[PDB]
Amino acid sequence: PRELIEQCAFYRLIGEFDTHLSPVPRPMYLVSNHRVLINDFNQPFQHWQNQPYRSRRYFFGEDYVCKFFYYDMPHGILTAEESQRNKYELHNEIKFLTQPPAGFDAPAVLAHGENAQSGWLVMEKLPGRLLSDMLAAGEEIDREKILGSLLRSLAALEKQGFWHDDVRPWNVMVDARQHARLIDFGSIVTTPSWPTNLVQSFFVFVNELFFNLPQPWSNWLYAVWQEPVERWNFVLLLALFEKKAKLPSAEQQRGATEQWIIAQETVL
Amino acid sequence: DLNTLVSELPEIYQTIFGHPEWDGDAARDCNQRLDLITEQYDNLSRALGRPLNVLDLGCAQGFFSLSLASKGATIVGIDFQQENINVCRALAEENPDFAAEFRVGRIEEVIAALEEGEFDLAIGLSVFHHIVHLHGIDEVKRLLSRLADVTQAVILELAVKEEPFYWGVSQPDDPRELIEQCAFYRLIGEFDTHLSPVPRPMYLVSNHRVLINDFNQPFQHWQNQPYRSRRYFFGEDYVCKFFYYDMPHGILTAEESQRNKYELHNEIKFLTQPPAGFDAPAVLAHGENAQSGWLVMEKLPGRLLSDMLAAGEEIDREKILGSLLRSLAALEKQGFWHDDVRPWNVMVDARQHARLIDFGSIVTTPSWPTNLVQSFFVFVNELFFNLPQPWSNWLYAVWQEPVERWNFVLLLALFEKKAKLPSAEQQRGATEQWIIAQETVL
Amino acid sequence: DLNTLVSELPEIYQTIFGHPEWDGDAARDCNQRLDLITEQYDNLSRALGRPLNVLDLGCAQGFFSLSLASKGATIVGIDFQQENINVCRALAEENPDFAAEFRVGRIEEVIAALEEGEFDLAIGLSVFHHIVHLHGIDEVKRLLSRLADVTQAVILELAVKEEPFYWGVSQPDDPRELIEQCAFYRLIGEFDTHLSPVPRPMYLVSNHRVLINDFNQPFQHWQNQPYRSRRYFFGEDYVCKFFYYDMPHGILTAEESQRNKYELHNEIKFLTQPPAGFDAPAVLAHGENAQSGWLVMEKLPGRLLSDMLAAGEEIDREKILGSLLRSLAALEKQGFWHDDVRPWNVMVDARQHARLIDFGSIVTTPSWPTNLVQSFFVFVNELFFNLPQPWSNWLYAVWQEPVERWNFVLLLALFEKKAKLPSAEQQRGATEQWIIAQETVL
Numbered sequence A: 001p002r003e004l005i006e007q008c009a010f011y012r013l014i015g016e017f018d019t020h021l022s023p024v025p026r027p028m029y030l031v032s033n034h035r036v037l038i039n040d041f042n043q044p045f046q047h048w049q050n051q052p053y054r055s056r057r058y059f060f061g062e063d064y065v066c067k068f069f070y071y072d073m074p075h076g077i078l079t080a081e082e083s084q085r086n087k088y089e090l091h092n093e094i095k096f097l098t099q100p101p102a103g104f105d106a107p108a109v110l111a112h113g114e115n116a117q118s119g120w121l122v123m124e125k126l127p128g129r130l131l132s133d134m135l136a137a138g139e140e141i142d143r144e145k146i147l148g149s150l151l152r153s154l155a156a157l158e159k160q161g162f163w164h165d166d167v168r169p170w171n172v173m174v175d176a177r178q179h180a181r182l183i184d185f186g187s188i189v190t191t192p193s194w195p196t197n198l199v200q201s202f203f204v205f206v207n208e209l210f211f212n213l214p215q216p217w218s219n220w221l222y223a224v225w226q227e228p229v230e231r232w233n234f235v236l237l238l239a240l241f242e243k244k245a246k247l248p249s250a251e252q253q254r255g256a257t258e259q260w261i262i263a264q265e266t267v268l
Numbered sequence B, C: 001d002l003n004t005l006v007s008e009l010p011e012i013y014q015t016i017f018g019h020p021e022w023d024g025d026a027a028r029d030c031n032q033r034l035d036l037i038t039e040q041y042d043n044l045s046r047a048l049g050r051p052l053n054v055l056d057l058g059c060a061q062g063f064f065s066l067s068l069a070s071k072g073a074t075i076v077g078i079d080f081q082q083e084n085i086n087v088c089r090a091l092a093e094e095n096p097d098f099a100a101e102f103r104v105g106r107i108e109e110v111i112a113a114l115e116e117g118e119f120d121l122a123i124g125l126s127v128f129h130h131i132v133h134l135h136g137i138d139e140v141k142r143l144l145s146r147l148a149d150v151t152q153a154v155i156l157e158l159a160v161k162e163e164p165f166y167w168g169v170s171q172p173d174d175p176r177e178l179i180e181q182c183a184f185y186r187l188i189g190e191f192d193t194h195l196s197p198v199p200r201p202m203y204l205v206s207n208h209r210v211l212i213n214d215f216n217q218p219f220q221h222w223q224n225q226p227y228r229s230r231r232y233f234f235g236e237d238y239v240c241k242f243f244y245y246d247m248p249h250g251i252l253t254a255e256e257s258q259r260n261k262y263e264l265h266n267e268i269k270f271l272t273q274p275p276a277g278f279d280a281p282a283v284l285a286h287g288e289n290a291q292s293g294w295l296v297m298e299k300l301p302g303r304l305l306s307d308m309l310a311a312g313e314e315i316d317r318e319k320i321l322g323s324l325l326r327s328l329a330a331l332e333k334q335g336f337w338h339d340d341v342r343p344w345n346v347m348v349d350a351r352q353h354a355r356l357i358d359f360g361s362i363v364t365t366p367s368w369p370t371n372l373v374q375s376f377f378v379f380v381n382e383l384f385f386n387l388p389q390p391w392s393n394w395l396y397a398v399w400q401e402p403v404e405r406w407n408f409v410l411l412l413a414l415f416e417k418k419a420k421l422p423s424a425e426q427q428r429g430a431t432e433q434w435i436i437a438q439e440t441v442l
């Protein structure tokens, strides 16, 4: 029955009723093209979006964004594992944002709830554009300020025992002054050798943000690669990043592998 | 009387040759098509050294036929309407020295009856859409193939599906579908029909000759897929590379057309001004326009490396790599590199010496050229994970070099001394091997 | 290169923005449509106080889209042909400060995905006939309704069945059938397509605003059938009366169009120059042309009498008749009468005072006004055979008057003294009663 309504912006199952014709009940939906209608939060929105950058919908109102995740979707669309991951991410995001770590400016939470079909989170609306859009629409970016600001927030999370498992352009928002922040906390984790894998992906992130690294970014990465692995973490990544202009020149060394492994990773 | 014959025409489609009193009545003035067709007539007549035999299919009131007979052509015009042929014959009789014959008949049957060599040039202007409409696209492709098979050149004006009439619906998606089975084709103009704002393209087609205004020569074979926007024609001492920038259907994205354009342009620039220290194939002709570009080069002996690899032919990898590396090092010394050294860009002669044959990927400026040295390892590995000593020792030595030192001069010098280099398998290594093996998969 | 992209267009439908070398090749020059569309852009941009977001459906080579982005618009152009969008993007790149995006896609799917407020203006020029031809008229009406629902204004150029081609047969009888479900529409021009002598009409359509060159305002509701050639739009302090003189299908005979024309014209004349002693609603704007005429007036409180009668609402017939008679007597003193006093022309406010609201039937010269006094009796009777005392006594008194004395001053004076007049039922009467009862049937 959702095929008759899924073209509409907002919809939610609100009940199921016995018809007395048979044992099969009929679902009742609440639908709107103009408002978020959640029992605790009832507000106009002025635009919405399904595909970020179809089980997730975002509604934008004057000072809010409402993230609406379907756990229960029609047709094939979500496997059991995917619904549970929708459930897990939104749940995890609610937990983090309602109790954020000191030293980290997290977007504020205005409302939230979950049920069998879906879950939602209404947050303060942040200025800026999503990094992946800026990259796609070839907009001018300051990679230094983006990486610096992001690394600073990742190092502060790590100091409080938090990491983010999925640092990618579509999870990062860049404001007018080119400062960046994470905007999806579904992938935040609290416990674990580690966090070595995350440091590795962060190199890919870096490379995709630009094989492609000029000096002194390449020198930065080369320095990290010379570190024993038990020492890889975001505090180290940040400290080396801040001093990258002083670090020795990678191209003067045999290297050369860190470059090829991430280039293959960045393909992979 | 001519007056009566003209009046009995169901339509005065064309200008009545020599009789301008009907020019206002003619559906098409024909002067624009005639300007272009006479230019192509002259080119081909010049190339063959003699006046041509010309076939005019659906010749209507004879205008093209008479206009070419006027310039010394021997012409036969065919049309299935008696009224049209009556006018053509009456016009020929006013011009008794023109060698012009006309016959009532169907184009389908005439094409089946043609013999190779009988006509040098056939023209078919705005007639095949009628055959498409009644017999379908596949039969028309075969008719047009036979027409090309039996002549030296064909000129077609083809109606198109964008024309606003009901019969447009039966047309192919693109008029090139009727001709792309033929070996050589080029758009030579576009004409207003006076039926609508949609013009009809005119194509010059051949199954026997490259017909480019500057270069008009037989070819004895041709090839589309190397090792479909690129065609190669082989004549006695030439190869003509013909790239389409404008292709039908989905076929080329914007970026791909521009890359076809870029590569051919870049190749022309390099070959017309090659660097000293590099033997580049010689350039005989070249040009570009909105639809396509072409380059005619001297023909080189040998076989393409990728064919030899595919057809498991015997190869000397030492001589192939040595010769190629020597030419790459000489390019680099002149500030040139090749971005795409692969088996399908390399030709190997009878003495097992190799050279590059596609210069589309040549570049002049940039850390660098480190990436190219890396791919060259893949090339090496595909030419054979798979490296025996001392090739493996060579690669291991390169990998021990600081990266700012990677370049083709170094690659060549180490290659020449590879028998002296230390044994890679005696070292911890081992990674250079695994990175290229993963690269060579990737 | 642009050259290549243009050549690969199946058709150069439009002028290539900034590239006049193809203007001779373009099927349509676009300058005439652009003149009109830029005028409407400016009007709406002025009204909203800002540059607009514009959607261009079937944008082809981008000419309208680029031309409006040039004036500061933010535009999105949609077309289902890759070749067209490749050219649009290449043109936008030559003009990097234009806020212009282009996407390959189908109009049907884009319309379904639109959100209200995203675009202020949508243009759909010569594209919907393709959707009619494949999906039928009803689906196109719904698409166009949604387009109007989500924007402030829509401009359409619509192909028509009189065009001589095979697809004309699938078109509606009249292009207005695709839009007449929308609230507001006006013909703004007619354009030569260069396919035939039949021009295509351009309509300005809105589901949210009255869009008249002199008056551009939101409305919050509208109505066709009063109490279909007349439409009423209600905004905060206005009512806009919009009369079609030119209607599709059979709908208006020649006489009816002329009467629409006559009534609206007459109403404009009266209200712009009202008689002293009569409070007429104020006039905010007005105009007429070949197709239609409009009048924007101050909005009056109250309900239409005929609705109150139909919805059995409580009415004070004394106050209604008194107030109406008073205004009719004051008109008559200034040499004005109203030819059509009926419940649907009368509005009753909260204090039960009544006034006329349609002045189409006002007249200035003529035995007379005896007929009007007669109908006013029917009015009276329908407002209630049905007359109790003293209304019946009033009518009886009027009927005893010589006919040269019948007029609205007399009707009013007798009405005010009706409680004093002799009892009709005590007289032989009895006919005045039966004549109006038969009239009130008739």
Ligand SMILES: C[S@@+](CC[C@H](N)C(=O)[O-])C[C@H]1O[C@@H](n2cnc3c(N)ncnc32)[C@H](O)[C@@H]1O
Pocket (backbone or CB within 6 Å): B013, B014, B057, B058, B059, B060, B061, B078, B079, B080, B081, B084, B105, B106, B107, B108, B124, B125, B126, B127, B130, B131
């Ligand atoms: C549109 S006219 C084009 C005339 C002429 N080729 C020109 O372009 O000036 C098509 C002509 O082809 C002739 N025709 C059409 N189908 C034919 C067929 N199957 N065999 C012979 N003639 C044909 C018609 O009689 C007509 O004269």
Ligand SMILES: C[S@@+](CC[C@H](N)C(=O)[O-])C[C@H]1O[C@@H](n2cnc3c(N)ncnc32)[C@H](O)[C@@H]1O
Pocket (backbone or CB within 6 Å): C013, C014, C057, C058, C059, C060, C061, C078, C079, C080, C081, C084, C105, C106, C107, C108, C124, C125, C126, C127, C130, C131
């Ligand atoms: C006749 S042209 C009109 C072009 C342009 N609107 C103008 O009037 O100058 C129709 C255009 O609409 C496009 N088109 C037709 N049907 C379409 C559809 N269903 N969705 C998107 N584009 C469509 C065609 O590709 C073509 O560019």
Ligand SMILES: Nc1ncnc2c1ncn2[C@@H]1O[C@H](COP(=O)(O)O)[C@@H](O)[C@H]1O
Pocket (backbone or CB within 6 Å): A049, A051, A052, A053, A058, A065, A107, A123, A124, A125, A126, A127, A128, A129, A130, A170, A171, A173, A183, A184
């Ligand atoms: N708190 C927020 N403030 C502003 N935009 C947001 C917020 N959360 C998500 N978004 C936007 O949501 C859109 C797509 O969803 P997401 O995957 O959350 O980025 C992007 O354009 C983000 O910029």
Ligand SMILES: Nc1ncnc2c1ncn2[C@@H]1O[C@H](COP(=O)(O)O)[C@@H](O)[C@H]1O
Pocket (backbone or CB within 6 Å): B223, B225, B226, B227, B232, B239, B281, B297, B298, B299, B300, B301, B302, B303, B304, B344, B345, B347, B357, B358
């Ligand atoms: N100058 C040339 N001489 C001989 N063969 C050539 C020349 N240029 C290209 N080819 C051949 O063209 C064919 C396919 O096109 P290509 O991609 O150029 O190799 C191969 O069989 C090549 O050997």
Ligand SMILES: Nc1ncnc2c1ncn2[C@@H]1O[C@H](COP(=O)(O)O)[C@@H](O)[C@H]1O
Pocket (backbone or CB within 6 Å): C223, C225, C226, C227, C232, C239, C281, C297, C298, C299, C300, C301, C302, C303, C304, C344, C345, C347, C357, C358
């Ligand atoms: N100036 C006005 N103010 C308020 N309502 C009006 C005005 N003019 C017409 N109407 C309304 O228009 C509707 C139908 O059209 P009409 O035939 O003009 O009555 C009725 O509901 C009237 O009350």
Ligand SMILES: [Cl-]
Pocket (backbone or CB within 6 Å): B138, B139, B140, B142
């Ligand atoms: Cl066949």
Ligand SMILES: [Cl-]
Pocket (backbone or CB within 6 Å): B125, B126, B127, B128, B129, B130, B157, B158, B159
């Ligand atoms: Cl044709």
Ligand SMILES: [Cl-]
Pocket (backbone or CB within 6 Å): C125, C126, C127, C128, C129, C130, C157, C158, C159
């Ligand atoms: Cl249309």
